[PDB]
Design a protein around this ligand. Sequence first.
Ligand SMILES: [Zn+2]
Length: 998
Amino acid sequence: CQDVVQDVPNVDVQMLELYDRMSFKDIDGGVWKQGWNIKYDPLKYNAHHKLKVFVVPHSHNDPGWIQTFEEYYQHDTKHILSNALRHLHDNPEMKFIWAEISYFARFYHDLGENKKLQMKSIVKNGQLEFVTGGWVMPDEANSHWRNVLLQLTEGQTWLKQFMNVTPTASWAIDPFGHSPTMPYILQKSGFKNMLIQRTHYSVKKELAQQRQLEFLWRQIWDNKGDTALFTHMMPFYSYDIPHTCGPDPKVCCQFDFKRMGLSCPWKVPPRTISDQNVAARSDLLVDQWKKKAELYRTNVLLIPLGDDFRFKQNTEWDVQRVNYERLFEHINSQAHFNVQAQFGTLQEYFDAVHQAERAGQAEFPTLSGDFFTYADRSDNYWSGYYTSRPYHKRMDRVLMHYVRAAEMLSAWHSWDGMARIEERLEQARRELSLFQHHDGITGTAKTHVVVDYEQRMQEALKACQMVMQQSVYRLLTKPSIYSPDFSFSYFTLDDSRWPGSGVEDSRTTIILGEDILPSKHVVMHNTLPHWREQLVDFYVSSPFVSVTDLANNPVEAQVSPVWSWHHDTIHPQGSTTKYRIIFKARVPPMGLATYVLTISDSKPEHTSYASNLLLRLPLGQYPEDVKFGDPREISLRVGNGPTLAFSEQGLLKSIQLTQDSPHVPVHFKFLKYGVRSHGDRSGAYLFLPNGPASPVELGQPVVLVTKGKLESSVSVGLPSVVHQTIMRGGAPEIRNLVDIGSLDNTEIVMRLETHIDSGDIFYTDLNGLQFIKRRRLDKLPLQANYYPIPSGMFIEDANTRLTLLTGQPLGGSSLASGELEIMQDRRLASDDERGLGQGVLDNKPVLHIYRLVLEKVNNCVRPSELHPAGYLTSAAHKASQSLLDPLDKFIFAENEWIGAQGQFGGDHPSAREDLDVSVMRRLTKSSAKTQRVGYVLHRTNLMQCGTTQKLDVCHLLPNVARCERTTLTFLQNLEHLDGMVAPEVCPMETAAYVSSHS
Ligand SMILES: [Zn+2]
């Protein structure tokens, strides 16, 4: 294994380093507004050194944006794919690339066998080429790497199954900035090349000037270069035809033949190509191509030809094909051009580029880093969509976990097709895959489309719950008794965090009575491959409840009241009819644990009761009366864990890690950003703040303090936010119920203030996979120092680190030494002129979840001050795991459960803490005679600060007949393991394995 901590990779372009030494001047470059007047030596070209031009037709299809998936399918996409099948069949020389397999599967399954075979013929002979072959073209900022791999797998599994093709070239023309997570996953999924477009105009100029627009993109920690993937960055402002022929859009627009009810903004229309004008038209176009070609190191030129939902009308196919063919015929026949031009595919471009490389014609630079935050012009930084529609951003992480749990729980067995496990899991995977779209999770779609995504994800959650509860009943019911009704609800799921009782009062109360129903079985699932102890809670009808395991061993518990917050002043009310029972569940690796909740007369031996302090109320049978008092400071400690001090407004002010350590200042504060009155308006995409954020007036808010042996919390009702700090004996958990209400042109930010001597350095993660060093640049505007916070952010000095872990992707920064900040929600009256044609006025209450880890790092082995990566501690990693993959809770639905067992997976290996089974998925239905199960293993890298059994997934299921290391999609064998043991994986590596069973 490589050391990813001590050694810094040597790369030609390191983006943090490049950023430091770039000026980012927005100079008028001429016809190429953000570049320069490109010049080439015409004697560069001759009969032995021709320019080879591939013109690659394409159609950018959004699976939701202005219209829903189905609306676009019926209005646009089904016509584009009908016409592609017809025109390509009829015209053997015509080419077309297709990215979105969600639309292609929708279309293909509706074809007659004749058309299906015709479709197969144009794929087989390379006329229609799939690029990436993901379900969608995903967002790269907010997306979790697990969901990027899921949507890739869903698209490529469809292509392999129905078209017997696996793309090895990626096409990502529209995501709003680019992540090195994409090459990481692509290169471990068999890919050889990828293409990107939306990178900062100053980065385009800078790389273009050095012909570094093609590069071997490696991971920021990769010393060896084994992660390297060949990347083509397109050089200009758009993927549209005016911005793809060459540097001058006024010329390129004349070669978009559909613009004869569309026109050219530069007011020179395209002209039909004739024998009268082909010599002149060809001279104009080839001059553009030769300028584009000066930006690249080979004599092979990519000329994309398309735009949004193009190639819809058969006459657009005619007018583009016939005019380009007249140009190609003229140019190829005229030796003075020294060009060979033709319709081509993306793979054809890359193949030719690598042929040129192998022949010594070019050697390509190496690059590490990311391409956030994107600006398409001036100060228009796209950091807005890191936060837009945060409700659905949170929903993404919930559904991610439920799909993982449902696939893992159901994987243990083969299921009868009558159970419809495969149908439910396929629905769940596709709704979540669809939401990865760059107008889904981004929050950049119209309100009615956001509603479609929400309803799709809600059906997906329901599908996962049905699979999970059937699976748990099977895993924990004696095989001699197990006799399932596949339509029956054996368990209901209990989720304290989604949507959140403050968002929807939906959690079921377990109603117990010595009369009516004395006891209830509950079951916890642990998707992680190690023993886990976590506090769990349930709603109960009485406070006099005792916890046992199934062996009747008592379990210490705490009962708290059920609190909710109300307006008219924001104040808490307490239930008289339901209570929280809280206890520590101990659950095996990838396993289940059964407990029993039992009512009594009065206070049981092993259940404690929390005190309640209301600073500024009956609780039925709750045996401790609520104490009252004036606003004042408070200090709480749970177990041996940290001591937290709170202001008289119920906001953290300091953390003491240990009894004999200092009171470290850590202040939470809420602030607000506004919208510019004059010039560019913030919208779904753009963050254009009218200066630094302003404190929110908190007034005299009501602070609720609940104190118990197992769990304590401070809650305050602030304007727009019910803020809560929960303590369970480690890093505290922060919950914000965010209701931005009617606060038009407002962004609400949560800031932490410390004396940590961070300076201009902070760390943010990419797709929950890796932490990247950021440097705050005063030469860039505020919105440019905003980065994606998909799962966490941290600041540190020589001695101290503060890490904030998130349960949802949000936008954030460190805008000053010792600060972190993270946006909670945004309400924007104005459109930001990127085509959505509305503001963001559909806000709804969302419960945001966080863990806050203050740590001493002076005895941690940290990377060199030159390393572009950071790494979490054990504590911060486990805290992230708590948020993303908590224990699942199941309440047995019926009065009695015959055959009930107490534990599943007691014999499962407890793997090293830095190892995860990201995916466990059964690949075969019951009717297959060799059953197959896919595993994705990810090993992170944790900082060694000076403090388990081997996991072989090949042997997790019995009767293993063989085991293959595969691509992450499971679609190709990479290494036969004669041994049928999976070798363990290196730090920051991800490997896939498929086990076969007889
Ligand atoms: Zn798009």
